[PDB]
Amino acid sequence: PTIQQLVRKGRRDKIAKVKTAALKGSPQRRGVCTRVYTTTPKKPNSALRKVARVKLTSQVEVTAYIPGEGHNLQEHSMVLVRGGRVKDLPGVRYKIIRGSLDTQGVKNRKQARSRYGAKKEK
Amino acid sequence: MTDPIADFLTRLRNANSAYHDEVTLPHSKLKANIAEILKREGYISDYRTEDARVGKSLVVQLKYGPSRERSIAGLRRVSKPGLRVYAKSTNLPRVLGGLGVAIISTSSGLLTDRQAARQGVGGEVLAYVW
Amino acid sequence: RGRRDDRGGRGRDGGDKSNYIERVVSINRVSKVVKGGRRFSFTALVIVGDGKGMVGVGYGKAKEVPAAIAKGVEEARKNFFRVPLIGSTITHPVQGEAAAGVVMLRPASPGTGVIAGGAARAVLECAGVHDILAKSLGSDNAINVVHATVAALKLLQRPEEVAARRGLPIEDVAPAGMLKARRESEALAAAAAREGSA
Amino acid sequence: GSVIKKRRKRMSKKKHRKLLRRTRVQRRKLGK
Amino acid sequence: GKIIRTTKKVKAHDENGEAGIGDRVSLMETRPLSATKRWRLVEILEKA
RNA sequence: AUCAGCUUGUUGGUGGGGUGAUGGCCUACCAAGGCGACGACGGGUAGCCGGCCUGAGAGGGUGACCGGCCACACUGGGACUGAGAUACGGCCCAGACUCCUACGGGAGGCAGCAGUGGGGAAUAUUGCACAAUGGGCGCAAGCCUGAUGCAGCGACGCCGCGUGAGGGAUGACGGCCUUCGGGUUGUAAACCUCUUUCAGCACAGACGAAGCGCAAGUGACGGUAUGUGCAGAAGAAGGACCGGCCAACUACGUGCCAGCAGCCGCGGUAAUACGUAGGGUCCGAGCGUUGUCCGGAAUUACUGGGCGUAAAGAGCUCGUAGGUGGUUUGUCGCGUUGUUCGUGAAAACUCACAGCUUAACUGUGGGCGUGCGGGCGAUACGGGCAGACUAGAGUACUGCAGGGGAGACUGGAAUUCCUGGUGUAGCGGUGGAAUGCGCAGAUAUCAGGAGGAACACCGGUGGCGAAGGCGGGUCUCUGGGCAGUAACUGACGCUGAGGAGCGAAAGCGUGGGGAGCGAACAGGAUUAGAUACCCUGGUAGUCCACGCCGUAAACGGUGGGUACUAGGUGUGGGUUUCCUUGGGAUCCGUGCCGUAGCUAACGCAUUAAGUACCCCGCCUGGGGAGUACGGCCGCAAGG
RNA sequence: UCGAAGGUGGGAUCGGCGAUUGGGACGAAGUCGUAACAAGGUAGCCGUACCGGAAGGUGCGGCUGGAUCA
């Protein structure tokens, strides 16, 4: 607007808007899991979601969601947390890899098959 | 009063939009050259220069068609003070695919886009009319 | 628009002349609250045209979908619109505006293809163009981009018309490449036309 | 426009004013 | 595309003190004569 | 700039010194500057580039391989040697660490190639050769070379090839649906011929070497590549997805569960959206996920956006830097432009061609290298200089209108109290009442007195002021506007980041004043309950003097300037032509209606939100929040 | 003379933790009222001051993004 006003100062982009604060710009981080409690979502979607809060190696304290039917992980398992997005429980935006370092792949999973980590039938 | 030629072409867009027969202007050299170009391309019909309060004046009659329809389908000042747009010879910007014309004031005077192309000189634009 | 494939032993399906190209752009059920509930109706934005470059724009209101489509066909039938071209291209870059609909319609060299979004792609696929280059800026809609595209095609004019407005002998109105494209397109009009006579 | 925007803004403003009533003293002394 | 007017406070060397404030002096690039005195001026045009 | 001042070898001079060379590089004296809102000095991050990725381009991201520069070599100083030094595998010192020691003292330095531990989501062998190319020393032979040449390892990437071909039914077995007819898998399979790349086993076996060598030999890769043979369909397919976008649907199983999901959203016993099955679709030695970037995003809009009500016009002016500039003659050639020279290494990129069975790949020749510097040319436009002009701007002169402002003096009606009459039981108040004032003489009425504040009527869609704002009168001092003439000056204009000034009400300080009204504060009433409305009382305040504060729906929700674009009708100020106050024409003002044009719509519409130019402010989803932190101003409230 | 490390000193500045405390976001479903939207039952809103368990109430000036029309 009034191009000398842009020669003075103007027209810069807004903000990087970083999605995940896992850290480092790293795709997945292994982590020590603690207190694997099960929660209640927002009002149109009522169920019990199986989350676990994980202390990423990156020293931060986050809370990840465990996809699949059940979780092999108990207290102090070395779960490999990737970044995802679950709308449904507020503040949980990370998903634990199933078929990983500690948490075994989902058993009798026969159709989804890459997610949930089920190895092929012999 | 900050731009002379913007008031010129502005007065041609208003007098063209409001179905006028003629228009009156403060005469100057650059407006005389632009009036001579728009004579030579036929966007206006003819202009005459009067003597008036103090200075001379430019009375342009506008060229209409087979009914009330207009020949100048627009003006747009591009080499405006504050962002005076310069043009090398590679491209005298083509206007409306070539159907419109570009009043370009090179070192040889004032030319159109086509004359700036063939004679091999560029160095300005001014407003371009279609 | 379902269950159209049918064979009838009746009087006639009344198939006849004017086998034009007809495109249905969008259908959104339009609701109206009245005392005790909602009254659903239907709007069909109907594009019709022939491959010369004559375009219609129809806007059908009915509480059935093929009824609204047929009323859009009859309304665009009532209201056609001539589009000037060069070969199968467009003449020169324009911008059309229907109150929020911005569409830039720019020509291109032949072979490129109609590159436009779905509303402008509909209005240009019904028309006589095969190779132009458009874009729909603003308003993110179907009705305003169709109507803005038709206003953009109203800002078109012939090279000859421009020459006529300025009282100048062509050559003197166009540049030369576009006159050569006039020679190419009229030459293939002569070839396919004289192959049409025999 | 609507007065709803105006009133949400004003709710914030009110709450803040109250918060400075009650902490007035405390801000003076904790600051000094 | 705005044609920006910019300034440049160079430093320059008069042996004879021929120039004063407000003048139209010439310049020419030299050897580095001190810490940022890299110009000497010949044929001063107009005095004030 | 939530970092505004920093600097004393710091800025310049002279004499020395030092250096390969100029020089606060150094030193003694002398002078006292220098650098900064074109962001100095500080803070944060970062090797820079040819390039790469993305994109229509403009631009955005990035700096891996390959190539060019720079900086460093355990951390931090220092010189020496030398043509040349951050001296990685040199020296000296001080540290931190590892190790040897007979305790006196020594030794180390993978950010060379391998390799180990650690950290990590994650990144390879303690390989073979100097045959080729580069490098060193040597007369040469030759010797050295973890540069390089190659090999190993990982679908880590890009490209190519394979897992067969042809025949084959009114379409078998099996599977799952079904309207119980059948339908799909499916020409697919079994079978019947045929062909074998690539893996397999044989035998032959390179080019890279117009090389080196005076020796007779010499290829690390290598018995590899590649040939010619033999046997036989023979050893060779998977992953995602099938509500919508978005190519692709049916059944069974659980029925707000278990789960799904990129967003919209699917699960509450008939889910094409969850799990399994058939089937389909899309890719294919891969296919999905996560992360990071560009794109779509015209969603920071130079190209290419906006600000009446959607986010967005500073409360209003004056003015510093800045940006911008009417008419016209000359000159300069700084912007602009034309042309030629030089340069923009190679590679990449693009076009053509050649080479490898093709391709990726590699090479040759153009173009690209959007730029910069030198020479020569042009002078319309911008600018500089030197001039000229009167239309913008300002001044003089003649009038004219006005709650423009400040100071001073004064006027009456009304309310309240006071003294005194006249005079009695109620007055006041309300939707209805009661607290309340009365019976000690109220309210009522008459006379007089005090005191304060506000100015009925004129007076309204009206005047003036930049905006707040301004109405009893008179006087004194002072500001602006408008018109007319054109007498003068001669572009002195416009805007204006920061900056100073003015700025309702409430509030604040010190000193006055205090009738009416009146937050807070009481009582009464209403009510479930009123911390409320309504009633009775009532302090700060409202008023004046002197200062603060700086805020408002400070609103035309519309920054300032300028030119133009059909009209119609009111009213305010002033000039003139005509009828002779009426009408016209004109300049300035303020309203109502209305075309064109504009707008998302309502609306605006010569007083633009229309058509254009100049400068400023400001906006970038909603909350969080005009809040924290920090600073500035303020007596504080707070801004 | 210069001089790295070391020592003493008082500060700048960037953070981490801190008992307690302020507010903020989300949760359903709880308690209390009903402030706003219709003249929302006292038109609403802006500034400011004061008060109140809370929404709020009142004063002073302003505004139509106000209503019916005395």
Domain covering B1-72: architecture: 2-Layer Sandwich (3.30)
Domain that holds residue A68: 1-122
Domain count, chain A: 1
Query: Domain locations in chain B?
Result: 1-72, 73-130
**Which CATH number characterizes residue A104's domain?**
2.40.50.140
Q: Determine the CATH number of domain B73-130.
A: 3.30.1490.10
Give the Cα-Cα-Cα angle E14, E18, E22 (nearest 5 degrees): 100
H or E element: which one contains A10?
A: none
Over its C-alpha atoms, chain C yields an Rg (Å, rounded) of 20
| Measured distance CA(B123)–CA(B116) in Å, rounded | 9
Method of determination is: cryo-EM
- Which nucleotide is nearest, taking the CA of residue A83 and each C1'? F290
**Neighboring chain A residues of B83 at a CB cutoff of 8 Å:** 3
Tokens of C170: 């062509």
| Measured distance CA(C108)–CA(C114) in Å, rounded | 10
Give the Cα-Cα-Cα angle B6, B10, B15 (nearest 5 degrees): 155
| Measured distance CA(B4)–CA(B37) in Å, rounded | 17
Chains E+D touching (3+ CB pairs under 8 Å): no
Are the C-beta atoms of residues E15 and E33 closer than 8 Å to each other?
Answer: no
A94 burial class (0-12, 13-18, 19+ CB within 10 angstroms)? buried
Q: Which amino acid is at B10?
A: T
- Which nucleotide is nearest, taking the CA of residue E6 and each C1'? F38
Q: Where are the beta strands (DSSP E) in E1-48?
A: 28-29, 39-40
Tell me which nucleotides of strand F come within 7 A of a protein CB: 10-13, 22-25, 34-36, 38, 119-122, 238-241, 256-267, 275-277, 287-293, 297-298, 300-302, 305-307, 309-311, 322-329, 335-339, 377-382, 389-392, 493-494, 553, 557, 561-566, 596-597, 599-601, 610-621, 623-627, 637-638
What one-character DSSP code corresponds to residue A22? S
Closest CA relative to residue B27, chosen from B45, B50, B10: B50
Compute the nearest-CA separation of B51 from chain A (Å). Answer: 37
Residues in Cβ contact with E22 at an 8 Å cutoff, skipping those fewer than 6 apart: E48
Q: What is the resolution of this structure in A?
A: 3.4
Chains D+C touching (3+ CB pairs under 8 Å): no
**Neighboring chain E residues of B84 at a CB cutoff of 8 Å:** 1, 3
Calculate the CA C59 to chain-centre distance: 14
Tokens of B48: 């005459």
Are the C-beta atoms of residues A27 and A56 closer than 8 Å to each other?
Answer: no
CB under 7 Å from any atom of strand G: which residues? A 40, 42-43, 90; D 1, 3, 6-7, 9-11, 13-15, 17-19, 22-23
Distance F69 C1' – E38 CA (angstroms): 26
Asked if B65 lies within 8 A of C165 by C-beta distance, the reply is yes
- Give the β-pairing of B101-102 and C132-137: unpaired
Q: Report chain B's terminal Cα–Cα distance, integer Å.
A: 26
Note the maximum CA span of chain B.
44
Compute the nearest-CA separation of A11 from chain E (Å). Answer: 15
- Quickly count helices (H) and strands (E) in chain E: 0, 2
